[model samples]
Target: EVKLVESGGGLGQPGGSLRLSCATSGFTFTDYYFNWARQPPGKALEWLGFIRNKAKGYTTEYSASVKGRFTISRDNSQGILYLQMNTLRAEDSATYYCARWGSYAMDYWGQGTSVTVSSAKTTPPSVYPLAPGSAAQTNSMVTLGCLVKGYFPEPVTVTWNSGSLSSGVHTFPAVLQSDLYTLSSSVTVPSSPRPSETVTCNVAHPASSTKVDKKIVP
Candidate 1:
């Protein structure tokens, strides 16, 4: 199996640069050539280029469509490959993948990384605290829930901050509902605080430059 992973961030901003990565394993990488391919949403697949490193030397070939703006390279020491694109534009939004050539064709492939290239900056997610407004003295533990809603592009990350409390936090993965995605995180804190205590939910997305936060009050 070929595993390809990309950094989880919001989206690539236009006029800015983005570097996509592909790490190969499960095979002798030097024995065959590897290619990077891409597919824009609702569009056909496009062959970006191929890179090979053998005893002879290192060689590369790129499609004319991306030859000028894209750079492809490999690092044998790390068992990984890289695709760096500069001067990005909105049209560059697409999903990229890596494949190894065999039997006269690309046989093994890595999972695709979805990227959105847009110049317009996105808005911050709306964050709020969830149910269980109060807790009993016997239970002493309050389940603090955070909801991050209405974020754009694709991926988002949520973090829980425990303020002045000795408790553990649990974060759930982001879930998509329609065009926007929502993230949830729960932290159990002492139901009775020392008069002044707080819990915060922090959100980070690629489209937005700064992290957004929401506080939970008793």
Candidate 2:
């Protein structure tokens, strides 16, 4: 099985330096090129750069944003791709990935490495669970809303009663104000929930000492 497993990223402070590695297998590294990609918290995905080796020498290229701060290195002999970053910033916090490069439109991708930088003040999120604007007994379904407000370092895990029920759940992009962030999520369920069913909005944040669970329905 072709695989690109990325590792070595986690919590870091601004201005810190870090190194990441992508252990590759199932294919000869020299036959394929590799690139790094990253997605910041609530942001779009970005391709950082690529590296390859030829008979003459090695060729490397980087995006302008991280041209100097980020470096990509690889050793075809060992089937690996390595990335290093210097002078990291809060915006640099992201899930980094490594992918096999190809011009033919087909590429293999790695899992991901999560990097979170400590920047703003640490504040636990305030969670509020609310039933649909109006209970829909006549309708076949009910939509419950969850509010997570006034949190810092915007990454939080929002779940429905301790479950990842479905992708049908909607969590809106966090809105930032006064250096704090607020997010809202909604989930729809059958109107006539069973007695054994529980409807709760559970939010987990790193800054928080405990998880917040709000009952959205009785």
Candidate 3:
């Protein structure tokens, strides 16, 4: 089977350097073309470079966007392609993918290696449980909403009580507002709450090392 696999991507700050690797199999490593791409605006991969490794030497055509900050090379002995992108920026914190080069578009796409940039303004989402009756209601069941707002970097999680969640729940996609983001999740619970009744909305985010709990009461 023809396979192109990649590794080495995670957290790194701006102005830092990253060395990414792609290993190949089921083909002659020095006889094919390989390219690296990144999801800049989060989809539709953009090219970083296209490379060819031959008996004589290696040739690469890089996108001007990378300019002098990126490089692509492969080692026949190692049978792996390497990418070194230096002087990285905040926007570079994105998923990068490698593939056996194609004509119209790349195929046999490999698993993406995601990168996260650590920097200032790493704002964490603050969770808030909406007031009762603000969401859907029924004769026997009531819906509770948890709102997470003002977050950056966009990776966060929500749990009911303590991760004991089941059916009848929906988590909406994060919406970007100005520079931060907002996310909302709701769950359908049995009946409306009585006096002294409360529900807790728990959230986990990269911004905070500790968990945050938001409680709503009736």
- Please report the candidate that would top lDDT against the real structure: 2
| TM-score for each predicted model, relative to the true structure | 0.55, 0.67, 0.73
**Clashing residue pairs, candidate 3?**
none
lDDT of 2 by residue, 1-218 (tens): 88999999977778999899999999777866788989987789998998865642558889999898989888768987899898988788789999986555327899999997765678988888766544544368777779998998757878986885565599888877655789999887776662237788888887666588888755
State the C-alpha lDDT per candidate.
0.71, 0.81, 0.76
Which has the higher lDDT value, candidate number 2 or candidate number 3? Answer: 2
Q: Return whichever of 1 and 2 wins on TM-score.
A: 2
What are the RMSDs of all candidates, in order?
Answer: 9.2, 5.2, 4.0
Q: Identify the leading candidate in terms of TM-score.
A: 3
Clashing residue pairs in candidate 1 (N, C-alpha, C atoms within 3 angstroms): 10-206
- Per-residue lDDT for 1-218 in model 1, tens only? 55556442247777778888888777776766779888986789999998876753658899998878988887877778788888887678778888878666887777788887754335567887775644523366677777887777545666666243335676666554554667777777666651256667776777776577767765
TM-score of model number 2:
0.67
